Design a protein around this ligand. Structure first.
Ligand code: HEM
Ligand code: HEM
Ligand code: HEM
Ligand code: HEM
Lengths: 259, 255, 261, 266
């Protein structure tokens, strides 16, 4: 094998096709593609970590999660590159781009799903692509990594309501008081439940990082296209601002008030 | 209409990952290289336009592109943190399946080396079996580097530059030249009279520095995975002594 | 000069300024995290004041270099939160009883920073009334045209028709949107080659605001992960107060112009 | 303004609590140059972080020696975050150009970083013991005390070797107990033990994670050493002839040698 052959560089390096004649489009493309590639790896690591939670093998899953942390670090910092795109540069390419939409990233949606941000409406963008629909549908129906953590807590003897241990996995993650009581006992007695303590903090980290990514995205988008006002709640910067209110692991955050 | 994945070629880029081993960690090894190569693509794109801005004496937009190149280098130097999470056993399990493919074979990396003036004709060899890469690398070899172009722009601004450095065999390593340093010194000693050149000088130093860091992270991560003169970590260690823009660094002591 | 390392850097003071009040191991982090940030803020003020003087005596190229320095500083300040993020709620709970009413609300350097960036607020002088020396720095800072005010004035000196009422005004009032100022910026961004320094300058400002939003957002996220929606030692609503200050725009016309482009 | 306490005539404020009169009045430029503030602040912030780093390393080492590894891992995680700040910091000082430095140089005198006792305590805790490095601190008996206690105390790595021995690994006794003033050097029995650990990570997860935390620590420290020489070289250049050549030599420091060797023998 050559380097290029083993790495698939014939494909990786022939997928940059600028629609406009503008110098700054290569940036626009490469920034998305690098992100998509890292997401592929994040998905691979998260799914393995979830399998470790499932099988009570937390130590290797912690390692996987740490790797996800360092991947997320790349992704948040990446915005530093796109931030060198200016409004005039983007408006030069704009007319050539068409309706495309990060909304159509099926990898990003599977990440949200794996993190418990379930939404069956988010299947629609993928309906024309039965292979993508399948991936996102199956993830919608699979218990989230947080669902698995709650299940693990109950398999460690914490009295969690059965309706959050087994439920319709296609529904959004909603605060449950028995789950906060369990995390409270963990954080009040860390040396008695060190692994759950550590687990809790790795979830908070993952949420923290993802929040940062959400914020850096909407900030960068705004600095390139603005806050297009009065254009719907469904898309644009208005939508991306609402995405800042997403809570992934609710009782891990609430517990801080109640400690 | 054109979809997100149609525009971004996700069909290609997202099915180009082909692990040879059963090891869970091979995906990392692959995606690390791929994301880096992608970024190198954009870096090339940006450096070539910056070089054109130097040769046309339009430095303002060139500076903006170089600033962008720096942000990409920041990404590339930090990436190493992700690979750092591969432990030797992990890479040990993949290794039997890799075959003696090497980073020597990255033509994009070699073009970056060349545009930066680190010219070396022996380096075309790994690319002989692929006419498209061989062309790109050969052309780059014969093309004056961004440094060469900066030197020539100092000549056109009226600095006395040795004729033999304005026009030269361009397949030749970049080499210390005393008149070039004297021009750079005049620039640094009087920054307000030569602001653009002062700023450009510093962009070069930044770039070389950021490249040194990448050099160092690479060899250190390689060592922490497979452990410690022809080829190997020893080769990577010698790479640390590469000097790209000799007289900008020399000028520090003579200032 | 045969004065030593420590003597030159004042390490006797720097390195005996740590005074943990609780028995908790994690309090040194709480202290050093603030201290390092405050030190970097001093440097930042130092650079922003100079960069502002550059703007106002029309020496933009040095001021650009200085703002690039502020930007490298902001980058440290924003990544710094990764350190504090290693603090857990029980760790913080253990030192909280010993802390009293001290809170970053009473940072005077932070206020100077907001002021120089045009987020003027007279109410913000009171937490400093007990130290007449800080009072005076902050009060003078309130009264001084911001770096953004100086950019607007610069634009007027370059021939852009800016309303006199924003070329000269009561400087203690916070920044408010002005249509003539957006028109000025729009012309610059539509004709970048014809106005490159202004174009570069506008982007410096946006970078600055961007970095500052990041810092504010990392702050409030870190605070929530440590104390949730508990009220702040400073007496404020805590996280909800901090989320509100995320809402403030420093340089309105530079953001608004992106939609009108 | 939002229920915030305004009045601090009686109460302990932020500045009281943090000793900010101490911190914020310790900057005394000697040249009239704009850029000296940077030179000073850069060092001071690194010294501050270095203090916290000692605080956490000492506590981490305590957990190593009481076989309480979990808390130690968390401390070591924090030290890694601190080290990231310290490696990235060089981005700021990189903005200083030779002419800016040259202007303040005449005013500095013989202030060596050799004279940072905190930095020497970190080298020492990490096993880079060198008695000749107490010299710079002889004029300051409390600094000298700190540094020489450190020289005499077993390094964090020594304590890990020691813990492996308490955990049943055959370690040469002449490495479990040792002249702690002596530089750390390669012991085959120690590599043997790490090799057992890495070939069987699931049997020895805690040591496996510990080993990698040492390697992380050393790697980040290497990065700091590289960014240091590089930033120094771009400000004052490389005199061939202490010096930039001293700093180049430092790149050859190895702290945890059998953890690096074991990659080749795995
Ligand atoms: C200047 C460049 C960019 C612009 C103008 C932009 C704009 C937008 C907008 C307006 C949305 C809201 C949905 C919509 O209205 O279609 C969105 C969503 C999204 N974008 Fe970006 N974006 C940019 C860069 C990127 C990059 C580099 C990525 C990397 C993959 C990305 C990934 C996503 C994802 C994954 C979503 C869905 C988020 C959610 O549903 O919460 N975008 N983008
Ligand atoms: C643990 C994983 C890695 C190992 C073990 C490794 C090993 C090596 C070694 C030993 C060399 C020296 C030449 C040779 O003998 O083949 C080399 C060169 C090179 N590697 Fe890596 N490497 C790794 C990761 C990476 C990554 C992620 C990249 C990113 C693209 C990369 C890019 C390169 C390049 C561009 C060269 C040529 C450098 C030059 O000529 O100065 N390597 N690699
Ligand atoms: C995990 C530790 C921290 C906690 C729990 C925390 C909490 C808070 C809270 C609740 C406030 C609101 C005012 C109040 O009610 O007191 C505040 C304000 C503030 N804090 Fe923090 N903080 C932390 C770390 C830091 C650090 C490291 C800095 C660096 C200097 C900092 C700087 C500030 C500033 C400047 C304000 C006033 C901001 C404004 O009024 O817009 N904080 N902090
Ligand atoms: C442009 C600024 C700097 C210059 C020119 C510089 C130069 C040097 C040089 C030449 C040495 C070798 C010993 C000697 O000959 O005195 C040294 C050592 C040292 N410096 Fe730097 N330095 C700079 C910035 C810094 C900063 C910001 C720090 C942060 C604290 C630092 C920390 C140290 C330490 C701890 C040593 C001893 C290293 C060892 O023994 O391995 N230096 N410095």
């Amino acid at each position: 094998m050559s380097y290029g052959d083993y790495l698939g560089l014939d494909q990786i390096l022939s997928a940059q096709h600028p629609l406009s004649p503008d110098h700054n489009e290569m940036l626009f493309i490469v920034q998305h593609q690098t992100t998509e590639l890292w997401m592929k790896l994040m998905l691979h690591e998260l799914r393995a970590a979830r399998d470790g939670v499932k099988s009570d093998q937390l130590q290797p899953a912690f390692k996987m999660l740490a790797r996800v942390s360092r991947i997320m670090d790349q992704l948040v910092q990446a915005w530093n590159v796109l931030a060198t795109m200016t409004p005039p540069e983007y408006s030069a390419m704009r007319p050539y781009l068409g309706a495309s939409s990060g909304f159509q990233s099926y990898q990003y949606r599977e990440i949200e799903f794996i993190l418990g941000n379930k939404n069956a409406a988010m299947l629609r963008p993928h309906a024309h692509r039965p292979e993508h629909l399948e991936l996102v549908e199956t993830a919608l129906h699979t218990p989230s990594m947080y669902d698995e953590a709650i299940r693990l807590m109950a398999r460690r003897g914490f009295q969690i309501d059965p309706e959050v241990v087994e439920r319709d996995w296609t529904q959004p993650t909603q605060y449950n008081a028995s789950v906060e009581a369990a995390w409270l006992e963990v954080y009040r007695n860390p040396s008695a439940h060190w692994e759950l303590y550590e687990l809790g903090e790795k979830f908070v980290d993952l949420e923290d990082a993802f929040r940062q990514w959400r914020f850096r995205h909407v900030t960068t988008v705004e600095r390139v296209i603005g806050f297009k006002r009065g254009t719907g709640g469904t898309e644009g910067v208005s939508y991306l601002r609402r995405m800042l209110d997403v809570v992934l692991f609710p009782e891990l955050w609430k517990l801080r008030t109640d400690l």
